[PDB]
Each structure stands twice: as C-alpha cells, then as structure tokens.
C-alpha cells in the first residue's frame, strides 16, 4: 500500500481510484468502510 500519492486502490472489492491519507475519524469495531451523504466512499480500513 502506498499513501499520499494518487494511486489505483482496491480493498476487498471496493476497486476505486484516489489518493489515501491517514484519517482522524474512528470506525466502529465491526464497521469496515465508511461513506458520505452522497453515497461516495470517503474512508476505508485496511483489512491487513
């Protein structure tokens, strides 16, 4: 995994495009990947 650079990313099947940065927001223990009000992905947890 490479962050801070515009890369093609895919985690378990999300298969999106974007640059990944370390995020302040905290997930729930079970919740895997977040989303925004516009149904666009905004935060993902690395499975590893």
């Amino acid at each position: 995994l490479v962050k801070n650079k515009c890369v093609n990313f895919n985690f378990n099947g999300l298969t999106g495009t974007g640059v990944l940065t370390e995020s302040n927001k905290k997930f729930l223990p079970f919740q895997q990947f977040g989303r925004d009000i516009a149904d666009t992905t905004d935060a993902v947890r690395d499975p590893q």
Partner: peptide, 22 residues
Amino acid sequence: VTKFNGLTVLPPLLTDEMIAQY
C-alpha cells in the same frame, strides 16, 4: 447560513473579504 464525480465549483472572482470591502 450553512466528493467530486466530475463536477467542480469555481471560486467567486470577488472573495468574501473583497465583497466585504465593497
């Protein structure tokens, strides 16, 4: 008074400080 899928927003030519100055 109170992400990108191709669409974008452009900043106004007169920013809020310049509009306040006007």
